[PDB]
mmCIF file with all atom_site columns, C-alpha atoms in Angstrom:
data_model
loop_
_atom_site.group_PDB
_atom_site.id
_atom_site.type_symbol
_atom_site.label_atom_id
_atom_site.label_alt_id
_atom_site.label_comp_id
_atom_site.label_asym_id
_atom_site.label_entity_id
_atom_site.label_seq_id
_atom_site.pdbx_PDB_ins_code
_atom_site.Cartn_x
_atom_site.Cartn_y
_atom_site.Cartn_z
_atom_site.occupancy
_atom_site.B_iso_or_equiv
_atom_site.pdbx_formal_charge
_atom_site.auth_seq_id
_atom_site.auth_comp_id
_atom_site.auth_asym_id
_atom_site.auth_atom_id
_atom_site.pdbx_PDB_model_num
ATOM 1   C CA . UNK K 1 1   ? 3.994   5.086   -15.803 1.00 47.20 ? 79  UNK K CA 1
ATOM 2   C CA . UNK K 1 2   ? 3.732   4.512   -12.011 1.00 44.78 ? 80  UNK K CA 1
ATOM 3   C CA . UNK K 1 3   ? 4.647   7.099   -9.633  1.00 46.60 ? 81  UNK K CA 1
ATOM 4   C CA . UNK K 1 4   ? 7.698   6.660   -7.163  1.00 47.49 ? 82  UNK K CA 1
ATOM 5   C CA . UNK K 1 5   ? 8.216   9.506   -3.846  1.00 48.69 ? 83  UNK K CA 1
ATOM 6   C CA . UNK K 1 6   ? 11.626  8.685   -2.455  1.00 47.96 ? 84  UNK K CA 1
ATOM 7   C CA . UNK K 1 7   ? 11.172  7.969   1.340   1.00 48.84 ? 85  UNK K CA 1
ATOM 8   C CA . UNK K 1 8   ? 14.447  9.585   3.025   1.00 49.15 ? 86  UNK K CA 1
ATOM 9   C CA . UNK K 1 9   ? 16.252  6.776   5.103   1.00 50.09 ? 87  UNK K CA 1
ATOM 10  C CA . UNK K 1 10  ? 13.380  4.139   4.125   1.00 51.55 ? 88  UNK K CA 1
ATOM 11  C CA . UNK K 1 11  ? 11.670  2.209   6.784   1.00 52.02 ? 89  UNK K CA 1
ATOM 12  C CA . UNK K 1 12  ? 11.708  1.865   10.597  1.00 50.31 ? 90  UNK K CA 1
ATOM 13  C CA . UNK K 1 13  ? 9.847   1.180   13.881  1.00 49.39 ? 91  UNK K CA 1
ATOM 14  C CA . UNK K 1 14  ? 7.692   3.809   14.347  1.00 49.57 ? 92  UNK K CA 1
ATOM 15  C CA . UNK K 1 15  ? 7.575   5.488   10.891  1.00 50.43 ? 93  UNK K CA 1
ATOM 16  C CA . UNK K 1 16  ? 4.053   6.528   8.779   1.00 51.14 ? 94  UNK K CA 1
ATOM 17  C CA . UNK K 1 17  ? 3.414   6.770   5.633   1.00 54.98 ? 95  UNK K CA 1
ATOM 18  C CA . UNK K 1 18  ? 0.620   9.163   4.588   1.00 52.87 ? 96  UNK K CA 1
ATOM 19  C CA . UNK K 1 19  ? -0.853  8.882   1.175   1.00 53.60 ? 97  UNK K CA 1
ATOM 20  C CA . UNK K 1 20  ? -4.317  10.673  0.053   1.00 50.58 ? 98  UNK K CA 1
ATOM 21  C CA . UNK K 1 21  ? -6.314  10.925  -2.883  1.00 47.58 ? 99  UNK K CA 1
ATOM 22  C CA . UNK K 1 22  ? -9.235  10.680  -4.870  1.00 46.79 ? 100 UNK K CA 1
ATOM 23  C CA . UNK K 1 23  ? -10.540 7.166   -6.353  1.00 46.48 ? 101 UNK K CA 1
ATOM 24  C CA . UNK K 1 24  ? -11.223 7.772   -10.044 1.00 46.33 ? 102 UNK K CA 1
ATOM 25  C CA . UNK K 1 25  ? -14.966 7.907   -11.232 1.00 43.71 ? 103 UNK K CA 1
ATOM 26  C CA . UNK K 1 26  ? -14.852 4.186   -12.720 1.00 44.54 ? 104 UNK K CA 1
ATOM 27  C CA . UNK K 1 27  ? -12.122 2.691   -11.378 1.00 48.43 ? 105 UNK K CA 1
ATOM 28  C CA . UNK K 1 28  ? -11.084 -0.553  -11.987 1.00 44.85 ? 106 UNK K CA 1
ATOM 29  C CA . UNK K 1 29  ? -7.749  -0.735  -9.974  1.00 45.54 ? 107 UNK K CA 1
ATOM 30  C CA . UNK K 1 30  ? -5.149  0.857   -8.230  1.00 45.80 ? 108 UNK K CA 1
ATOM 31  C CA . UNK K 1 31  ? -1.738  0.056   -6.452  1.00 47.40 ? 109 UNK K CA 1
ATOM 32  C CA . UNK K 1 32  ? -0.124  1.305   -3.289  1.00 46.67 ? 110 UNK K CA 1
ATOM 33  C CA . UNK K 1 33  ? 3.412   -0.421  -2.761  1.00 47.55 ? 111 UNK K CA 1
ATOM 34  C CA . UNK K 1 34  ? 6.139   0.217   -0.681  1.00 51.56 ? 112 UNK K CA 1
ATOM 35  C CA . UNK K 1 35  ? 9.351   -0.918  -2.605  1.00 49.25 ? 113 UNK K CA 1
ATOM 36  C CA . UNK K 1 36  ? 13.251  -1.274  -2.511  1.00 50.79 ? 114 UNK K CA 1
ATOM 37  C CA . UNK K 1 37  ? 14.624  1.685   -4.597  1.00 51.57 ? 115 UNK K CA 1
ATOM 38  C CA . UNK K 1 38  ? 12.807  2.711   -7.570  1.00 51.34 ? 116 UNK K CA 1
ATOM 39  C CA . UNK K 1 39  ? 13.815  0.397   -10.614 1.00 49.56 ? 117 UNK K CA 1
ATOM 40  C CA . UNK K 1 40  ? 10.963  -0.836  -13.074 1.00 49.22 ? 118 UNK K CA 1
ATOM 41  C CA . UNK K 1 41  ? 12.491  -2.674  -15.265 1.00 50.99 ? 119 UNK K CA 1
ATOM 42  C CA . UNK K 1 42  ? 13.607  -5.239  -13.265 1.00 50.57 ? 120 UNK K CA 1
ATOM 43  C CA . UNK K 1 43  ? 11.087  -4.071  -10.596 1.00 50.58 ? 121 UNK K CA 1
ATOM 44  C CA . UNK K 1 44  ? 13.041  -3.418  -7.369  1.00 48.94 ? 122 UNK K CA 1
ATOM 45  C CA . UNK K 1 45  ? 11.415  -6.217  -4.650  1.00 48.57 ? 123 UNK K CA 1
ATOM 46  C CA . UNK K 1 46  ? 8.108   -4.668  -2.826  1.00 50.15 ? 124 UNK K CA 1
ATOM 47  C CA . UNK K 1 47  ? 8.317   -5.258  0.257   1.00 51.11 ? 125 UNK K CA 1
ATOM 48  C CA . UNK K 1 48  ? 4.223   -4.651  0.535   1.00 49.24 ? 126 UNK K CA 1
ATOM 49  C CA . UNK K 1 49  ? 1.389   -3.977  -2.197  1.00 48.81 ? 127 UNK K CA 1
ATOM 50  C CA . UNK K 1 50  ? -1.478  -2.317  -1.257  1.00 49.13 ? 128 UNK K CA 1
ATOM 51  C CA . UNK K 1 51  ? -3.863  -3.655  -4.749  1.00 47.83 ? 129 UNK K CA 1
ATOM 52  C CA . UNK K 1 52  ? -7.752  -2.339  -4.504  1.00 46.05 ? 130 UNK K CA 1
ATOM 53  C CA . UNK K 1 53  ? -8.960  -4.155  -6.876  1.00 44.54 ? 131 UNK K CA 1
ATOM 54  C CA . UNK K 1 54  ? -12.996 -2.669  -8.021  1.00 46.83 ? 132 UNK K CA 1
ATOM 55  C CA . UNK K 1 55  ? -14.591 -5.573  -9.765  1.00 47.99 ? 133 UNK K CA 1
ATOM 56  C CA . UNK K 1 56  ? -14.374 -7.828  -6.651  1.00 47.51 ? 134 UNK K CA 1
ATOM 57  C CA . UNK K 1 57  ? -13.986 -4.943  -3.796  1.00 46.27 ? 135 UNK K CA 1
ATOM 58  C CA . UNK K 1 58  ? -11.062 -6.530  -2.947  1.00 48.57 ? 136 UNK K CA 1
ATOM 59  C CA . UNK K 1 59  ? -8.028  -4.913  -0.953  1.00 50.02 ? 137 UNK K CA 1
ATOM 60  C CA . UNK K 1 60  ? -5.558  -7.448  -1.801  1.00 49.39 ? 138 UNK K CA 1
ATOM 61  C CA . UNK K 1 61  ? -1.832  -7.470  -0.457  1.00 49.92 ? 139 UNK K CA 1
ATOM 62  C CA . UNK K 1 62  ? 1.635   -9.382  -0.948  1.00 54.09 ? 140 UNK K CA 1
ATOM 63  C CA . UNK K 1 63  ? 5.086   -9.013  -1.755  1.00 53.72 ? 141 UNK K CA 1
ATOM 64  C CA . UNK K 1 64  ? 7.845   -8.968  -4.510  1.00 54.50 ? 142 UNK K CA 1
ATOM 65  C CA . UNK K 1 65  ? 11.357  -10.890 -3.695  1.00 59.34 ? 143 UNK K CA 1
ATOM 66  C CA . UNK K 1 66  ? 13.672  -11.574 -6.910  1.00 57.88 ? 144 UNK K CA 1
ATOM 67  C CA . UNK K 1 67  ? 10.362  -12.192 -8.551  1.00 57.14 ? 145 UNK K CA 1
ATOM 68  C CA . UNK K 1 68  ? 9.064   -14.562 -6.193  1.00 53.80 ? 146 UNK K CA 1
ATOM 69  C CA . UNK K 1 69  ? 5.570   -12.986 -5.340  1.00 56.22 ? 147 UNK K CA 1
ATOM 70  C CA . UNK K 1 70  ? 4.601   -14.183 -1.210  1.00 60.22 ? 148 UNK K CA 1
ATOM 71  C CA . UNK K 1 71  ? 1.291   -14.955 -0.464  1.00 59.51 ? 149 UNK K CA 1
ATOM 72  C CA . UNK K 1 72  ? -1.555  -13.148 -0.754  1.00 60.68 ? 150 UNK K CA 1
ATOM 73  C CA . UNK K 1 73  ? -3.970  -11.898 1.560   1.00 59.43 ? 151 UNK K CA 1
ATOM 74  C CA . UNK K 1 74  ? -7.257  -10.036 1.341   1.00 58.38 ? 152 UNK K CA 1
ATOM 75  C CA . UNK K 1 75  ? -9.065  -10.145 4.628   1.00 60.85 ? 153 UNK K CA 1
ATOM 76  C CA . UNK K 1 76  ? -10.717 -7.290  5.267   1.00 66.80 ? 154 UNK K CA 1
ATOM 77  C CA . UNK K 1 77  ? -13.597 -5.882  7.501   1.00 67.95 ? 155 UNK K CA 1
ATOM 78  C CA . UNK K 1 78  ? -15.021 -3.691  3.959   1.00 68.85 ? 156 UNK K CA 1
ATOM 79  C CA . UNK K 1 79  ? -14.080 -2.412  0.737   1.00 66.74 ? 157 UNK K CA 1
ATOM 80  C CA . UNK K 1 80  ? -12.935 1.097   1.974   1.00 67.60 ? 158 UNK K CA 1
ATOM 81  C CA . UNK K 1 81  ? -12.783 2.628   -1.144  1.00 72.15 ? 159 UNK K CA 1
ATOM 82  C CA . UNK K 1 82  ? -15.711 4.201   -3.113  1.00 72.38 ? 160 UNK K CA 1
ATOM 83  C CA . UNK K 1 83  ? -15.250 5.755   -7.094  1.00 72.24 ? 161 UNK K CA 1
ATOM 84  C CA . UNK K 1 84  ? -14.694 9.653   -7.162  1.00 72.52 ? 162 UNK K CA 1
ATOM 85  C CA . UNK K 1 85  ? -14.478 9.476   -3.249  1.00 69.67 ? 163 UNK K CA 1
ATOM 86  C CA . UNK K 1 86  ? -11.381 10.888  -1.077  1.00 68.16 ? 164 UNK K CA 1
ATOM 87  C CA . UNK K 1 87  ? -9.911  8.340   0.944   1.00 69.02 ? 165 UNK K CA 1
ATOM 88  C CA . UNK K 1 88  ? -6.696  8.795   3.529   1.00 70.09 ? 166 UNK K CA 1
ATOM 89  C CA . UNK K 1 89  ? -4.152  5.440   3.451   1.00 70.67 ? 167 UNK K CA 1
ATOM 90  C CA . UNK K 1 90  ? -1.046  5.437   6.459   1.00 72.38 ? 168 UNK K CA 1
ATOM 91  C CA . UNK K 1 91  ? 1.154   2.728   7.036   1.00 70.25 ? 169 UNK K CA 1
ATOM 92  C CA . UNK K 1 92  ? 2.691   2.144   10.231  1.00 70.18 ? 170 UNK K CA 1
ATOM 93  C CA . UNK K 1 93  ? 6.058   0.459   10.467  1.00 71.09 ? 171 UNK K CA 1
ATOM 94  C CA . UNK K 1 94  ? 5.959   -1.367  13.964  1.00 71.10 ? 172 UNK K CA 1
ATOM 95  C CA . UNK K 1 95  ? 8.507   -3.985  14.772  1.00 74.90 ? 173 UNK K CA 1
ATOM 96  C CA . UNK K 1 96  ? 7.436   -7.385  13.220  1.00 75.15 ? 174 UNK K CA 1
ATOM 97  C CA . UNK K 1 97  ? 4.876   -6.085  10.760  1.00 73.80 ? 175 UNK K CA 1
ATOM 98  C CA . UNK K 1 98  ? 3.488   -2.705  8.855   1.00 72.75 ? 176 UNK K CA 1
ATOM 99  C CA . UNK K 1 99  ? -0.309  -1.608  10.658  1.00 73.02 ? 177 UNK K CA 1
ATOM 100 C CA . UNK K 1 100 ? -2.486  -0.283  7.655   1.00 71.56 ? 178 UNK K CA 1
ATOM 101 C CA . UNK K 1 101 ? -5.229  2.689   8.488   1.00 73.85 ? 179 UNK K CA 1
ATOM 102 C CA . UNK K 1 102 ? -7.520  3.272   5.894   1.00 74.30 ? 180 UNK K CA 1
ATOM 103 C CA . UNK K 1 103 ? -9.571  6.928   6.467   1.00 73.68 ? 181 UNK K CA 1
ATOM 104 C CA . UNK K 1 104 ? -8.466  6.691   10.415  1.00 71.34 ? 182 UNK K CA 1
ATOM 105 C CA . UNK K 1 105 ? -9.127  3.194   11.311  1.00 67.41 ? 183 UNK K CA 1
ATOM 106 C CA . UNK K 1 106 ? -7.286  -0.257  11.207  1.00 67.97 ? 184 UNK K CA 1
ATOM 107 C CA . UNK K 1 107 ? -8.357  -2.464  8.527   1.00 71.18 ? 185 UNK K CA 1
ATOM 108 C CA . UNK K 1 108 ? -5.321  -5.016  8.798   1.00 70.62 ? 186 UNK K CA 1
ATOM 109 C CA . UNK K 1 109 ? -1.777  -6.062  9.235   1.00 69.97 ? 187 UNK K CA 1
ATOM 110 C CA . UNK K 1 110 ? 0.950   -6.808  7.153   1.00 68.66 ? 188 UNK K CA 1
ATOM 111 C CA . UNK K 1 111 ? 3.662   -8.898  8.670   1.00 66.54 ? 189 UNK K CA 1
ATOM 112 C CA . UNK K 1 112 ? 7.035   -8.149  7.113   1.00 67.27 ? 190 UNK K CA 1
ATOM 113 C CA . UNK K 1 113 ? 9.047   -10.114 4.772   1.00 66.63 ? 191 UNK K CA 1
ATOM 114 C CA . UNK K 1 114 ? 11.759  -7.982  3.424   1.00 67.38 ? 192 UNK K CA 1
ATOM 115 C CA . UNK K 1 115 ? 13.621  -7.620  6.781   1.00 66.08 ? 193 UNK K CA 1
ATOM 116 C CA . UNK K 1 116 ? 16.066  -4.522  6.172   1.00 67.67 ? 194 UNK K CA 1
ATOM 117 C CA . UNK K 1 117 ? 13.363  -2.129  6.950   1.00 63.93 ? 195 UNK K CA 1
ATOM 118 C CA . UNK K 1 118 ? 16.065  0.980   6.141   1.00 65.81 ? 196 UNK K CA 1
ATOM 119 C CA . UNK K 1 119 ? 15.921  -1.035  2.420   1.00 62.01 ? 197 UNK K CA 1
ATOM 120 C CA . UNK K 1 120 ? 12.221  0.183   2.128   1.00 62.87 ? 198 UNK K CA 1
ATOM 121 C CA . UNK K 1 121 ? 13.097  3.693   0.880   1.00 61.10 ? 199 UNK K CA 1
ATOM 122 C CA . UNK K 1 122 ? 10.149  4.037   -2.122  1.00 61.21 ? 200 UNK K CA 1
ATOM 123 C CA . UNK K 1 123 ? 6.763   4.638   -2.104  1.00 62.49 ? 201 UNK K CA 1
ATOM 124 C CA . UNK K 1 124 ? 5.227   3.506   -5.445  1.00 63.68 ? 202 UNK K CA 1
ATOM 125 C CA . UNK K 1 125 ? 1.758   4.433   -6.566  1.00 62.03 ? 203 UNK K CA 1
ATOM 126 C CA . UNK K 1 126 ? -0.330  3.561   -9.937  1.00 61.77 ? 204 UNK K CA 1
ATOM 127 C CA . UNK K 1 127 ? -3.657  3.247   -11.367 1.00 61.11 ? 205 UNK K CA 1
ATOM 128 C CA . UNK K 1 128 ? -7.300  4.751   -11.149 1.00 62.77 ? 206 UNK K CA 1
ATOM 129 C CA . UNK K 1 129 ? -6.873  7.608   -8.804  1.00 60.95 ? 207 UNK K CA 1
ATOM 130 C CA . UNK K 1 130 ? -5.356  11.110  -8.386  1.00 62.70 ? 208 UNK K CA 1
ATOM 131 C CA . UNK K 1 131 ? -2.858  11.232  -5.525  1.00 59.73 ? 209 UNK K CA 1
ATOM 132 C CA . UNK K 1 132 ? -3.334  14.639  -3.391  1.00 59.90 ? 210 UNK K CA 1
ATOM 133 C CA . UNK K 1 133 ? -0.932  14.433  -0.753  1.00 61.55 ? 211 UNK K CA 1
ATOM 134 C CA . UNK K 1 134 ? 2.108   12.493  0.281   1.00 61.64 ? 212 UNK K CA 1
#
């Protein structure tokens, strides 16, 4: 059962998302997405996932259209996330892509896909942590 904070009037240029928490003592995974409505089953499109995935220390992202994952990219400077650690995650809307800050600093760009930005009115959250605010 994944969390889902309704985000009044979705998506636009210039909006941040703020999500903090702590990473759970032995994680293995844990999902940040930013989705189309709320629906699960049949998952409303994502138009970014944020997936940390432990085993690897991989921070891996793509998208959700009618099923049709995009592709996926990983890139990143570090692994920003460390078990039983507090960590601070905002995503910036800006005009042709989301900016993602990870504990105050850029760690990459997400260039967007789903293009009705207004559409983008979920924030969806699951796995090894405990979500503290936002």
């Amino acid at each position: 059962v994944p969390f889902c904070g309704h985000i009044k009037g979705g998506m636009r240029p210039g909006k941040k998302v703020l999500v903090m928490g702590i990473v759970d003592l032995n994680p293995e995974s844990f999902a940040i997405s930013l989705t189309c409505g709320d629906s699960e089953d049949p998952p409303a499109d994502v138009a970014i996932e944020l997936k940390a995935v432990f085993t690897d220390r991989q921070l891996l992202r793509n998208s959700c259209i009618s099923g049709e994952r995009g592709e996926e990219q990983s890139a990143i400077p570090y692994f920003p996330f460390i078990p039983d650690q507090p960590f601070r995650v905002e995503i910036l809307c800006e005009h042709p892509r989301f900016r993602v800050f990870v504990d105050g600093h850029q760690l990459f760009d997400f260039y967007h896909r789903i293009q009705t930005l207004s559409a983008i009115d979920t924030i969806k959250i699951n796995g090894d942590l405990q979500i503290t605010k936002l």
